[PDB]
Each structure stands twice: as structure tokens, then as C-alpha cells.
């Protein structure tokens with residue numbers, strides 16, 4: 001039976017093989033929204049050519065590529081299974097992957113959705129916490145696709161642009177934290193200090209009103225409440241690159257710091273993303289828990305499992321979508337407010353594309 | 360009946376009159392908890408004599424000095440009435456005011472509590488969101504005192520060192536917001552944008568590990584939940600001074616930004632303090648809502664009323680203590696963890712002072 005309701009799962013994406021590395025850097029650097037380069041159409045391809053080795057090396061050290069497609073899919077399948085059962089008048093459901101910077105590209109997936117002749121399309125970001133650099137960008141990609149192509153959308157669109165405190169999302173996190181706690185030696189369970197590590201931002205983006213830091217902060221608190229404050233915590237930020245100021249403290253600096261001060265049992269909890277990817281498999285597990293931790297005198301260091309294939313995250317996804325359909329919401333109230341200091345003419349356009357949709 | 364339990368309400372303070380402005384600044388600049396100035400004992404007396412006229416002129420602009428004590432007092436009487444009826448086991452309850460930089464000073468308050476022969480002393484911060492510049496500084500004073508004085512405490516000690524999301528505190532902010540939304544023209548209510556405005560911290564404090572941003576953000580979220588996201592929002596930060604980098608967006612920049620983008624209806628909600636003080640009556644109500652937004656084209660800017668005399672906030676305060684007392688805790692789990700990049704030797708000592716009280 002032909003697909004009625006499409007769910008576009010948005011994520012930035014990662015290179016699947018080492019061969020996909022160059023074209024991933026290229027799209028990243030060609031993007032005027034993300035970075036502003038002099039002679040951008042000449043520099044981007046050369047900067048990418050030069051950075052490819054450094055980055056292949058990173059995927060090399062985790063086994064040759066990203067797994068976000070495998071997990072994103074596995075999540076998709078469970079979601080659809082559930083929804084067709086939760087919501088028959090909107091069945092059958094299909095999921096589509098819209099990676100921002102690798103195949104299948106956002107623009108490629110939208111192309112398929114229209115082709116399948118769906119009635120309703122739901123843009124569903126896989127970042128629980130909104131940032132203009134992530135979700136903002138995927139949403140812009142959609143507006144741009146229909147502007148680019150110069151035709152109207154043949155489906156009734158909407159978005160779940162954020163959901164940083166979803167009750168089941170909160171649960172999956174708590175369960176993974178708890179069960180990982182049970183893996184620390186009993187004589188240190190109480191001593192365990194928790195570091196919620198989220199992808200950092202450049203200060204210039206923060207200072208502009210990006211809604212991310214407040215939302216990631218919102219999530220941490222909700223999880224800690226469910227844990228009944230069983231251990232102390234901190235929210236720290238990973239992934240700074242280059243000399244400019246970014247939001248702190250730095251996940252690494254914070255690891256070293258605590259070690260120097262005798263807090264040698266650190267559990268790392270990846271709160272800003274739902275699946276494994278480079279930020280956990282290389283940055284946290286290798287460059288931090290392996291080396292760093294070795295040269296700082298660490299005792300135990302562990303990393304709560306990413307949600308990945310946990311069936312409860314499946315439920316979370318179906319629940320969100322289901323409720324979103326039950327509410328007739330077109331986008332969060334939050335999306336209707338662009339960052340107070342936003343330059344970038346397109347943000348308004350996108351916000352209008354979503355609030356203006358038919359029905 | 361002599362007092363049994365003593366409730367030390369901690370807060371930074373503000374000059375009660377134009378004449379108190381000098382000593383207030385002199386005491387801020389002498390704090391090794393906040394300012395590392397060369398030859399500090401000589402610099403601060405100068406840097407005060409110098410800044411004093413600027414600061415006086417501000418208080419003038421708001422009637423003549425700080426309302427902090429008037430509100431702290433009242434809030435305190437209400438809390439005690441209720442406590443005596445909620446927890447009669449703790450016998451008569453007395454409230455003491457410990458301001459950090461004006462009389463009655465924490466030091467003075469501790470003397471008075473001592474020579475009252477209380478059985479129990481509670482260090483209650485009047486800052487729901489913990490920062491090492493606010494609550495920490497108050498707590499360091501409690502320790503520093505009993506250490507300098509050579510004696511040891513003659514009464515059981517403990518702290519409610521934080522409470523960013525206490526449900527009655529949430530009810531109060533939401534209640535004032537709703538009330539303030541009824542003062543906008545009907546036709547503009549849904550178009551009202553909310554800015555929660557918290558006193559900012561310098562980036563170096565944020566980057567060092569400070570709890571504040573994550574907690575403030577927690578509060579914002581709970582408050583917006585209760586309001587069921589009726590209007591869009593951002594969390595923004597006020598009161599930057601000097602040339603160094605601070606956590607933004609600056610609140611002023613945000614007002615002016617929203618305004619330039621045609622979001623010309625704004626409701627300021629001070630979310631990190633529980634009374635009027637200089638930051639609201641001058642900064643927000645006068646430099647921002649009067650001078651600034653007038654020359655920017657603003658249609659309506661209001662400010663949610665500070666918690667002040669709200670009887671329900673009194674209940675909140677009593678509610679926090681009754682629970683603190685019944686649960687027997689000495690402090691939060693969060694206090695038992697210092698900033699990962701903390702460089703201040705007293706933070707260890709102060710934590711110990713609380714984690715290790717008898718009973």
C-alpha cells in the first residue's frame with residue numbers, strides 16, 4: 001500500500017567511508033551560512049583537499065567511517081513500525097534520511113518524498129536541542145530546495161524542530177547513565193563525577209542568540225532530576241577547533257582539571273546527540289578517555305552508551321511524531337522567534353515557509 | 360521562648376543610601392574571591408573613591424538607594440510565621456540577614472546567631488541559581504569567619520546552597536509573567552517576545568566551570584513549561600562591565616536587535632534574583648526600557664514584577680527549609696563538586712566545612 005505520511009530525519013551526517021571524507025569537507029566549506037570565506041568557490045575545494053588526510057585519519061582510528069546512517073536507519077524502522085500502529089488514519093508511514101553534508105542529501109530525500117506522492121511531510125530534526133548551525137541549517141535546506149527548484153511543495157509540510165525535554169528521551173539517557181554507573185567498581189560509585197559533554201559553539205554564534213546552550217542545559221537538568229541527583233555533575237563542551245573563543249569549559253580541560261584535583265572517577269555522558277559518531281568514538285573514547293586520561297593520572301573513566309538501537313528511543317521517536325500529528329502543530333512556538341542578533345535573510349524565509357503551510 | 364533554629368538568608372547587598380555607596384564598593388574590591396588586583400589593599404580604596412560618583416548617580420535615578428533589605432526582611436518574616444506552624448519541632452524560628460558587602464554583614468549576622476544559642480544554623484542563599492560569585496562567596500564567608508575567629512561553630516551548620524527549580528519558585532515567575540501579559544494591548548499579546556535576563560558572568564568564570572548558566576537555563580525551561588510555551592523566548596544576560604569578554608547575548612543588544620527586526624513587543628523577565636535592586640530598577644527599567652527602546656522604535660516593553668512581597672514566595676521559602684530540615688541534608692550533591700578549573704584554595708575548605716558537620 002502506497003505511503004501516506006513521510007518522516008524526514010534530519011542530521012548533519014558523517015562520511016561513511018574514508019572516500020566520502022573530501023566531498024563532506026567540500027559541502028561544509030561551500031556553505032555560506034556556516035562560514036564566510038574570501039574567494040569562497042576557489043578556497044573551499046583547496047581547504048578541503050588539504051584537510052582530508054587529517055580527517056580520514058580520524059575515521060581510520062574508529063574503523064573507517066561514520067555509523068550515523070546505520071543507527072539513523074535502525075531508529076527509523078522502529079519508529080515507522082510503531083507509528084503505523086499508533087496512528088492508522090495517517091498510515092502507512094515511511095522514513096527518509098536527510099543528511100546535510102553527505103548522501104543522501106537533504107535535497108535528495110525531498111526529491112524522493114515528492115516522487116512517492118506523500119500527503120503529509122514532517123521535518124524531524126534528530127538534534128533534541130535547536131541550534132541554527134544544525135537544525136537551523138537543515139530547515140533552511142528545505143526552504144532553499146523549494147526556492148532553488150522554483151516550484152511549490154506538493155505535500156503538506158510541518159516540523160518537529162526541537163524536543164530537548166521529551167520524557168522518554170530523558171528516560172533513555174537516565175537508563176544509560178545508571179547502567180554505566182553499575183560498571184564502575186562499587187567502592188567508587190558514590191565518588192563518580194558526571195560530565196555532560198555537548199558539541200560547543202563559537203562564542204560569536206552564542207552571543208547572537210543561538211537557542212542551543214539554554215536547551216542543552218534544559219536537558220541536563222531534567223535528566224538529573226530523574227536521577228534524583230545521585231552524583232554531582234557539570235555541563236561541559238567539546239569540539240573546539242582553531243584559535244577563536246568558544247563556549248566553555250572544554251570537555252578535555254575539564255577532565256584534566258578534575259584529575260589534578262583528585263576527582264579521578266569521571267563518567268562521560270554525551271547529551272547533545274542520539275547516536276555514535278566521530279564526537280564520541282574518536283574525540284571522547286580515544287583522544288580523551290585513552291590518552292589524556294592516561295597522562296593525567298585517571299582512575300576510572302567511562303562513557304555512557306549512545307542511545308543507538310535502544311528500543312525505548314524508538315518509542316520516543318514514534319511518540320513525538322504521533323503527538324505532533326495529534327496537535328496539528330506546524331512548528332514549535334520557539335521557531336517563530338529568530339535569534340535577536342541574526343544576520344542571514346534566509347532564517348525569516350524558512351520560519352515563514354513553516355508557519356504559512358496549508359492547514 | 361529563645362530562638363532555636365536560625366535561618367541565615369544570604370545575598371550580595373546594595374547600599375541603603377547614597378552615603379553607603381563608598382564602603383560597598385570598597386568591600387567588593389577587597390574580595391580575593393573576585394578580583395586579583397596588584398597591591399590589592401592599596402588599589403581598591405582608590406578604585407572606589409573613583410567609581411563612587413558613577414554608582415551614586417545610578418541610585419539617585421531610582422529614588423536614592425537599594426530596596427534589597429526592605430524586601431529581604433518582609434520575605435523573611437513571612438517565612439518564619441509559616442515555619443513555626445510547619446515545623447514546630449524545631450521550636451521558634453528566627454531569620455538573620457547576611458549581606459556580603461553591606462551591613463548587616465554575614466560576619467555580624469554569625470556573631471548574633473552565635474550569641475543567641477541556637478541549636479541549628481541554616482545558610483540559605485537567596486540565589487536560586489548557584490554561582491561561585493554569589494552563593495559560593497557567601498558560603499566562603501561563613502567558613503572564613505569561623506576560621507579567622509579561631510573558635511569553632513557552637514551550633515549545627517548546613518546550607519540550602521541552591522534551588523533553581525523549586526516548584527513554588529516556578530509558580531511565582533509564571534504568575535507574574537501572566538499578570539504582566541495582561542498589561543499589553545490585547546491585540547499584541549501573542550506577538551509578545553519574552554527575554555529572561557540574568558546577570559552575566561565573564562567568560563573566564565564560565566570557562567572555569569561555574570554552575571550558574573546551566574542552572575538559570577533550567578529555571579527558564581521549567582517556567583516556560585508551566586506557561587505551556589505561550590510566547591517565544593530567549594535567555595539573555597545583563598550588566599557586562601569593562602573590556603573583557605562576557606557571557607552573552609547582552610540583554611541590551613537583544614532588545615535593540617529584536618526591535619530592528621520588527622519584534623517590537625517585549626516582556627523582560629528577571630529570572631536570577633528575587634527582589635528589585637539596581638539591575639532592574641535602573642539597568643532594565645531606565646537605561647534599557649526608557650532611553651534605549653525609545654530610540655529604537657519599540658511599541659511595548661514591559662517588565663514582569665520582581666517577586667518582592669508576593670505571599671506565595673514566602674510559602675516557597677518556608678517550603679524549602681521545612682524540606683531541607685526533614686531530609687537532614689547538609690548541602691546539595693552539587694556543592695560536593697568544585698569547578699573543574701577552580702584555582703581558589705578556599706572552595707575545597709568551604710565544601711569540607713559543610714559536608715563534614717556533626718549530626
Ligand SMILES: C=CC1=C(C)c2cc3[nH]c(cc4nc(cc5[nH]c(cc1n2)c(C)c5C=C)C(C)=C4CCC(=O)O)c(CCC(=O)O)c3C
Nearest residue numbers: 373410414490492493558559560561564600631636637638
Ligand atoms: C565573577 C562574576 C561576577 C563579577 C566578577 C561581578 C562583578 C560586579 N558586580 C557588581 C555589582 C552587582 N552585581 C550584582 C549581582 C550579580 N553579580 C553576579 C556576578 C558577578 N558580578 C551574579 C551572578 C549576580 C546575580 C544574579 C548586583 C545586584 C550588583 C549591584 C552593583 C551596584 O551598582 O550596586 C560590580 C560593580 C562593578 C562596577 O564598578 O560597576 C562588579 C564589578
Ligand SMILES: C[C@H](CCC(=O)O)[C@H]1CC[C@H]2[C@@H]3[C@H](O)C[C@@H]4C[C@H](O)CC[C@]4(C)[C@H]3C[C@H](O)[C@]12C
Nearest residue numbers: 034035036047051054202204241242243244245
Ligand atoms: C580549523 C580549520 C582549519 C583546519 C586546519 O588548519 O587544520 C578552519 C577552516 C574554516 C574554519 C571555520 C570558519 O572560520 C567559520 C567559523 C567562524 C568562527 O568565528 C570560528 C569557528 C569557525 C567554525 C571556523 C573554525 C575553524 O577555524 C575552521 C574549520
Ligand SMILES: C[C@H](CCC(=O)O)[C@H]1CC[C@H]2[C@@H]3[C@H](O)C[C@@H]4C[C@H](O)CC[C@]4(C)[C@H]3C[C@H](O)[C@]12C
Nearest residue numbers: 012028029034051054055133134199200239241
Ligand atoms: C570538520 C571540521 C574540522 C577540520 C579540522 O579539524 O581541521 C569542522 C570545523 C567546524 C565544524 C562544524 C562546527 O562544529 C559547527 C557544526 C556543529 C555540529 O555538531 C556538526 C556540524 C558542524 C557544521 C561542524 C562540521 C565540521 O565538524 C566542521 C566544519
Ligand SMILES: C[C@H](CCC(=O)O)[C@H]1CC[C@H]2[C@@H]3[C@H](O)C[C@@H]4C[C@H](O)CC[C@]4(C)[C@H]3C[C@H](O)[C@]12C
Nearest residue numbers: 393394395406409410561563600601602603604
Ligand atoms: C572597569 C573597572 C575599572 C575602572 C577604573 O579603574 O576606573 C574594573 C575594576 C575591577 C574590574 C574586575 C576585575 O578585573 C576582576 C574581573 C576579571 C575578569 O577578566 C573580568 C571581570 C572582572 C570582575 C573585572 C570587571 C571590570 O573590568 C572591573 C570592574
Ligand code: FES
Nearest residue numbers: 132338339342347
Ligand atoms: S541565526 Fe539563529 S535565526 Fe538566523
Ligand code: FES
Nearest residue numbers: 491697698701706
Ligand atoms: S570557583 Fe567554583 S568551586 Fe572554586
